[PDB]
Amino acid sequence: SGLDKYLPGIEKLRRGDGEVEVKSLAGKLVFFYFSASWCPPCRGFTPQLIEFYDKFHESKNFEVVFCTWDEEEDGFAGYFAKMPWLAVPFAQSEAVQKLSKHFNVESIPTLIGVDADSGDVVTTRARATLVKDPEGEQFPWKDAPLE
C-alpha cells in the first residue's frame, strides 16, 4: 500500500546473489536503513542487522531492506557486494531520496521500520532500538509512550 506509493513502484530488489521479487515481502515487517559507503562511521552499524535478524528471523520472520545514500554507484556497488538483505536497485534510487521525506530522516545513518501490509510507518527509531532492544518484545517499536 504505502511502500508501493512512497516509491516509483519497485517490483524487484537486489536481494543478494542477484535479485528477488517484491512479493516476497507481502505481509511482513520491513525496515529501511539509510546510509552510504563514504559515510563518516561506515564501521559498526551494518553486520549487526544480520546478527539481530538472522538470530530471530525464524520466529520473527522479518526482512530488512537497505536504502543507499550516495551520489555514485561506485559507493553503494561495493557496498552491496556483501550485505545479503534486500536493497533497492539504483534504478529506483529516486525513491530513497523521497522516502526520507516520509521518514523525516534528519541525517544518515539511520534505521526505519515499516509494515509492508499496513503501508504506513510503524517505527522510525529503529536505529537505537535495533541495537538497544535485545528483547524484541515491542519490535514494531511504535510511538514512544515514555513521556
Side-chain angles (χ1 to χ4, degrees):
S1 277
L3 291 86
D4 279 32
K5 171 62 162 311
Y6 317 142
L7 331 180
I10 292 111
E11 203 114 73
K12 295 235 298 188
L13 275 168
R14 302 276 314 102
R15 175 108 169 79
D17 218 26
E19 274 188 310
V20 135
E21 304 96 26
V22 173
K23 54 178 174 204
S24 173
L25 331 193
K28 66 152 297 288
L29 182 64
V30 191
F31 278 80
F32 290 93
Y33 197 101
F34 287 16
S35 175
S37 168
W38 48 259
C39 75
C42 282
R43 60 209 223 295
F45 220 138
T46 277
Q48 253 160 315
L49 219 318
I50 296 299
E51 212 288 337
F52 169 55
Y53 259 47
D54 193 23
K55 278 303 202 167
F56 243 55
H57 158 45
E58 48 223 332
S59 165
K60 282 250 52 249
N61 207 67
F62 46 22
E63 201 51 42
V64 170
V65 188
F66 159 87
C67 265
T68 191
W69 243 68
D70 305 67
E71 64 111 288
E72 203 88 325
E73 308 181 342
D74 270 303
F76 114 103
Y79 192 89
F80 85 77
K82 307 261 262 219
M83 36 184 237
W85 55 64
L86 301 131
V88 183
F90 202 77
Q92 312 269 320
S93 83
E94 302 288 19
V96 176
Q97 311 215 328
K98 281 295 304 186
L99 195 33
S100 162
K101 228 141 223 261
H102 266 97
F103 294 135
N104 204 42
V105 186
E106 181 256 328
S107 293
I108 44 44
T110 202
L111 179 38
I112 312 292
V114 303
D115 268 323
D117 227 59
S118 268
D120 302 20
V121 189
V122 189
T123 160
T124 57
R125 71 240 87 199
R127 45 150 92 199
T129 60
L130 187 120
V131 229
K132 311 288 186 207
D133 296 19
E135 307 172 340
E137 61 145 331
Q138 336 213 62
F139 55 110
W141 322 308
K142 76 175 202 298
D143 216 312
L146 316 147
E147 245 82 51

